[PDB]
């Protein structure tokens, strides 16, 4: 009791020192610095392509490395590879369990990762001597629902599960090589850094934790939400990231300085955010909401510059090509739209 | 094909074949009755699993009855926040709840502050008032009635219900329990609750399930075709 109380007081006074340093270094907010720039007037994106063929709610998608192919997953039990130029299907993969919540595309373009309520992450090999697609590896070390997964490289993967833990695996051996246990709530998303050395992870306890892949300790933490966290993605530079919560608000955090750079929210919106993605230059932030349409925010002024109102249901997945030319959005109506 | 090469034509043909296969798979899979089996604490969940049968996150059960294919989802072992994965069962046909009424005098395995029936009622109320199950039918399946009948003779149900005054027999107590469980419903118009007492024969349980799902199917078809 006494030891716990004194230790909690010590942690609180370290937090007070940290926030005092934050306030001392916060001479002017990001909005004050960036108000001098010229804001964008109005951007309009039209649906160049409309992918159809899914018969259930689409929950995840990932753009390809060449900005030409993409992957999509729904509850129908099918994983579909789409050619975004001519609207062609390259591969259709049946899933063992139809309860899937995430999918990833390998940077080399040879493997695809999937996972969901089955507590198992499945890897499928695309470039095979045979004419079909076969499962290469199965990870079953978690005891909670898998919420996100991203290929670290051709041989390593990182997954976030519902058991308040994250796991960096080793595909060739099949066993976890690093375990991250610092969350008190279900983990919903993660995003890899552009330099491929660190990664941030969001959970339901309104805290985002930054982890080191090589070492594997609680490198950084951030607490700025009042509800659960649904999406997270790094800035194109890699020194910042953006998180979306269930309180109809997104926040921008900085890796180097533990700050809250900007809060993207509006009084009209009362529903949370399912997906968050950035642009190539880091000027446009794309946020998918529960009000059946997406939104575009100018990241340096926190104002709305466009609405991609073309979906009849809640949007769940959003992605941007590596060259930043097309925006692919999916929704629960089983329709994928490429806005440009 | 005016400005499409031979390889482009072959790719288009492959895409059309994939579309045909996907449509066939969807048509094949859009004719199976999905049920969500759910219980509170230590109940007769596995009991009715064995009666109706005749990867720890979710358990899939497949069976057939009267040329009707039933897929039961048992997600008791997920052990996570229900609000983050319950929306994927929005399109489920029916929810088979599990309550044993013989645990009225038995306290919780973790504390004696409350008995299991109150937790069952509190979780039934949460399930009924869910935003994703406004028009999802619920079956009750009050089981373990024999033990309750034996226990009601030695110990009355006044302990569980201090405001209840009855004959303390079996029929009256069962009727009171059923009425209290039915009163937890808040809509009473968009959704309905079906109550049944399990017997030693699997036929009664499977027939009740078949009748309930048939009624739900008829209601859904009537709503779809605009006759109501």
């Amino acid at each position, epitope marked *: 009791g006494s030891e716990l109380d004194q230790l909690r007081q010590e942690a609180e006074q370290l937090k007070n020192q940290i926030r005092d340093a934050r306030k001392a270094c916060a001479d002017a907010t990001l909005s004050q610095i960036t108000n001098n720039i010229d804001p964008v007037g109005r951007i309009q994106m039209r649906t160049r392509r409309t992918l159809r063929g899914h018969l259930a709610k689409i929950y995840a998608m990932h753009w390809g490395t060449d900005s*030409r*192919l993409l992957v999509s997953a729904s509850q129908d039990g099918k994983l579909i590879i789409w*050619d975004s130029y001519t609207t*062609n299907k*390259v*591969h259709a993969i049946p899933l063992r369990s139809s309860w899937v919540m995430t999918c990833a595309y390998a940077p080399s*373009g040879n493997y695809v990762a999937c996972g969901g309520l089955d507590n198992i992450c499945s890897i499928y090999n695309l470039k095979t*001597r*045979e*004419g*079909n697609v076969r499962v290469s590896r199965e990870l079953a070390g978690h005891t909670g629902y898998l919420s996100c997964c991203r290929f670290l490289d051709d041989n390593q993967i990182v997954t976030s599960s519902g058991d308040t833990t994250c796991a960096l695996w080793d595909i060739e051996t099949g066993q976890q090589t690093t375990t991250f246990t610092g969350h008190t709530g279900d983990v919903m998303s993660l995003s890899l850094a552009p330099d491929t050395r660190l990664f941030v992870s969001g959970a339901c306890d309104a805290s985002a934790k930054l982890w080191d892949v090589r070492e594997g300790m609680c490198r950084q933490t951030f607490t700025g939400h009042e509800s659960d966290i649904n999406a997270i993605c790094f800035f194109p530079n890699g020194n910042a990231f953006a998180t979306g919560s269930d309180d109809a608000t997104c926040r921008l955090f900085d890796l180097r300085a533990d700050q809250e750079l900007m809060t993207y929210s509006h009084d009209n919106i009362i529903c949370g955010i399912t997906s968050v993605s950035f642009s190539k230059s880091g000027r446009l932030l794309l946020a998918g909401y529960d009000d059946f349409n997406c939104n575009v925010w100018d990241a340096l002024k926190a104002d709305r510059a466009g609405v991609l109102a073309g979906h009849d249901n809640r949007v769940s997945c959003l992605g941007v090509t590596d060259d930043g030319m097309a925006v692919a959005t999916g929704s629960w109506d089983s329709f994928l739209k490429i806005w440009n | 094909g005016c*400005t499409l*090469s*031979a*390889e*482009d*034509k*072959a*790719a288009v*043909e*492959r895409s059309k*074949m994939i579309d045909r296969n996907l449509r066939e798979d969807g048509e094949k899979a859009a004719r199976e009755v999905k049920l969500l089996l759910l219980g509170a604490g230590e109940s007769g969940k596995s009991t009715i699993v064995k009666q109706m049968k005749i990867t720890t996150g979710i358990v899939e059960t497949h069976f057939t009855f009267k040329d009707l294919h039933f897929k039961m989802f048992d997600v008791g072992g997920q052990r996570s926040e229900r609000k983050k994965w319950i929306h994927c069962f929005e399109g489920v046909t029916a929810i088979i709840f599990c309550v044993a009424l013989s645990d009225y005098d038995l306290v919780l395995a973790e504390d004696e502050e409350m008995n299991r029936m109150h937790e069952s009622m509190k979780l039934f109320d949460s399930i009924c008032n869910n935003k994703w199950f406004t028009d999802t039918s619920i079956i009750l399946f009050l089981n373990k009635k024999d033990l309750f009948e034996e226990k009601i003779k030695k110990s009355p149900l006044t302990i569980c219900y201090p405001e209840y005054a009855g004959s303390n027999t079996y029929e009256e107590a069962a009727a009171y329990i059923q009425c209290q469980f039915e009163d937890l419903n808040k809509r009473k118009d968009t959704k309905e609750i079906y109550t049944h007492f399990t017997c030693a024969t699997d036929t009664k349980n499977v027939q009740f399930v078949f009748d309930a799902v048939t009624d739900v199917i008829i209601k859904n078809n009537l709503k779809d075709c605009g006759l109501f």
Partner: single-chain antibody
Amino acid sequence: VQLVESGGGLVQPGGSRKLSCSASGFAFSSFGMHWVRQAPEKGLEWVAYISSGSGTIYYADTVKGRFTISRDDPKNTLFLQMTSLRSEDTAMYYCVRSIYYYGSSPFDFWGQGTTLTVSSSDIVMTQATSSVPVTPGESVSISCRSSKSLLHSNGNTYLYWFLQRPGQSPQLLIYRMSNLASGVPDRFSGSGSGTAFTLTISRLEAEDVGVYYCMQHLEYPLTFGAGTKLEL
């Protein structure tokens, strides 16, 4: 993965013959098939093509309406029925698998084929040279010509470079004029420009001797060119 052929033998001018090909080790139901001819002591020529699902069937112009092709997915067997065989129908026959999607590489596996002896507009491919003596350890170049631009509006060139070692089945080296095949050394390379195509070898080994062919796939019928022979 393998394909084996059967049906070859001695045939009189008046008669019919069915050539069978059986494939094992891959998904035959999703691979388009090509029947390709190769006259002895002369270049190889196209015969027929069948697409996946038996949707598209193409025949050679000189043998149009004269041969028939059929596919069997449950048994993974390809049949080529021939009704008439003249004095010019003596050659070897090969079956080639090819699957078409984005990033795919058609003409990967060639089988072994079988011989057949008889008891007796289109873009043209040509190569000026036919026999270039060379010693190992030096770069070599083989040139092919075309009568029209092979660059389609999509943005790729339908040019292929193969290899036929003496006594061995042909294999794939370069597909789409700029992409290397699978399982081949990096020494081989291809460079196309307008109507001039060059296959270049940086370091030459004793296994690189044989007859090279230049291949086009812009449109049907698929007219082929004469190979160039490199000898040790």
